[PDB]
């Protein structure tokens, strides 16, 4: 009549819809929360390993020549002093590196926040394109692979069978489950800047020749759980 | 059930609007018409969402959310219809004042 | 209390509506009842948000849904009840004008 | 009592403040939400394509596909020589027919940009003849497995019957890894990876796999720097 | 059409304000002008959300975003337009009192 | 800060309500009491959300929005307090209409 | 700009309030002051976000989001400012009724 009281109902509708959209936002969090948790789980474990690697090895990179390259890898520069001349035999110099580096390296890997966040520790042996002998492109690629695979495996042979590097029973079995000796070749070269080739730069032929200790995070399994939980739930309603 | 309530609510508001405009001469029924049309549409929006809320399963968030939004999206048409027809009544009231 | 607030909100508005209809011949208590029945619905919407967010945890949002769903149920059931009974009094006002 | 006209506008502003907030949250999590969808589309798409192309050849080759994007080859002593890395002619003809159609699926528009690594994995049983040491039963098995795994890779790109163009070879160099495994990662009688309370096998645990790794870790990673760049962009 | 919905809401409230100011002397149209202008902004807020959620899917948010954002635009633009022009009428009310 | 001002907002509304019922006979303070009581409650609710909005950012929405909801949980207690005491004033007006 | 638009809106409301209290005696401008003060704050809240939503499209997400959040974080400070000064005007009207 004289006073229009439908504004009271309009305020009632606006207030109720105000929390309905607040409810919808809350419901949307629950609907997609495992998917949202994957990037932060990856974010915390990669920087956690990166911070732990820095917290443990900054004072020792100069002596070893290694560098952490923000990819959870410990890239050891200057080969031909870590391995024999054209052979997989380990030189003495790399042994004291292996005795010192690995014992305090596995502790970070075999730690409560990191033991269940790792699928693979990749020992990778990379080789420059120029073979010592023939200049072929295909048969020399697989000649490097034979050498690099043995050089990487010889590193893995001494990494837990060494008397100084005393691995326990519960620690060795973690290596056979989480460690891979991958012998790469010219297929993964490093340019003069120190990064992987993207625009077709010139390989340094010395930075490419390297041995790396790369860590792989189990973030693919977390994404698989989201897919698996949806597939099992979808099949449940059939 | 929710979709039928929204269609019934929208159809009801139009029916009262036709009743409100076929008289158009009471001068007291028309004065209360904007309030009734908007309140009726607000009522059906409230009921449509409320019926969609009781069917929401807090355990099964993944499948309840599409069902909740299906009834929510059709509930706003009742409130919009009530305000639209009440605006016409007030627009017609303005047109009478210009004379 | 907490999970009985939606029924208390609905029941309170029905009780006030029953008071309004037994005072129908006053015609001064009327024309104020629709504005007060809806206002009580607005009161229970604010209570719904207040009780729906009182136990909200930022760390655990999954467990806060049942408590927040309680508030939305209280807000929508009581607001619909207040709007519905305000509609009835508005409709009864039409009957007085037409009779 | 005309204050309700102004109040209805305040609650209207409060209404759509949380509507935008819900929308803003919805927008900013779309990249995270799409990651399981990208993984589901690529993994099932690769598995369906692998099943479509090779289901008629699993029984003759002895291969098995187990929804892990891998082509597991059973029945040793015909793939390689007895205790040697030399490739037998039986597996050479298998690689000729299998790989050309295998690489076609791998070098496809929906999959070429969704693949990070294709792993050739040579697995060997836990027992080595002439040795009774657990430590010595893992490395000379790895020496043989690494050469056998490299032998398959060497044969693929240095053959005369596989139509490997000059441009496809670089793709194998940047993706194909000859990862020679060892006594680790055994298989039980059901073909499932061993658990704490299960045993292993000998003719089933000795295998050669062609496993595909999708680049979902990079897609998960690319969110991290994008979030960091967005955070750094406000400073 | 759907994409040109925010401008239709702004254009209609602007048009009614122009009608509200060509009279400027009835003093009964002007007393109803701020309520009608604000109600239309509420009307386009209701129908704007209605078209925003008409094609909204909780799974495919990206494909439901262009329509949802357009519905938010027409809700905010019309609410801003309705309040702004209702405020101009209110401001003009003082200017009659001062002189 | 939002939690502390919730008690001040609620505590103030009770104080103004007491001042409103100390007079209870002016008939001009009482007619404006429900409007001021509700407006004060909405004011403190808006400040509680405004304070919680300055800490909201889109850099990390997966924890900023849960932080926003955890900060504005007590903002609606003043709104509920304002409507509740305004209802009492309105109800007391009805009680005086029965005589 | 939206920070300055909100600051202008907040600054403008304090400017009209000063004009509204230096008179304090007209009693016809004063009764319209609380509505206009709230309406001005409502307008600046709406236009603050509406301006930020002009260039906010599905493709301009990484670009227009920073300027949309700036409007969101400051829009409701003008609405609270207008109600705060409108409440003072209404409260100052109570103190006149007690004498």
Numbering used by the authors:
A (entry chain A): 10 to 247
B (entry chain C), C (entry chain F), E (entry chain D), F (entry chain G), G (entry chain E): 1 to 99
D (entry chain B): 13 to 247
Authors' own words:
Using cryo-EM structural analyses, we show that the Zorya type I and II core components, ZorA and ZorB, assemble in a 5:2 complex that is similar to inner-membrane ion-driven, rotary motors that power flagellar rotation, type 9 secretion, gliding and the Ton nutrient uptake systems. The ZorAB complex has an elongated cytoplasmic tail assembled by bundling the C-termini of the five ZorA subunits.
ZorA I-ZorB I from Shewanella sp. ANA-3 and ZorA II-ZorB II from Sulfuricurvum kujiense DSM 16994 yielded protein samples that allowed structure determination by cryoEM at global resolutions of 2.2 and 2.8 Å, respectively. The structures reveal that both complexes consist of five copies of ZorA packed around two copies of the ZorB N-terminal helices, as seen in other 5:2 ion-driven motor complexes. The type I and II complexes largely differ in the degree of elaboration of ZorA and the length of the ZorB N-terminal helix, with the type I complex substantially larger than the type II. Unexpectedly, the C-terminal, presumed peptidoglycan-binding domains of the ZorB components, are ordered at the top of the N-terminal helices with the domains dimerized. Similar domains are present at the C-terminus of MotB, but structures of the MotAB complex have not resolved these domains, and they are considered to be mobile with respect to the intramembrane complex in the inactive motor state. Although the arrangement of the ZorB peptidoglycan (PG) binding domain dimer with respect to the rest of the complex differs between the two Zorya systems (Fig. 1h(iii)) by a ~35° rotation, the dimer structure is well conserved (Fig. 1h(iii)). As for all other such complex structures solved to date, both complexes are presumed to be in an inactive state since they show no open path for ion flow from the periplasmic to the cytoplasmic face.
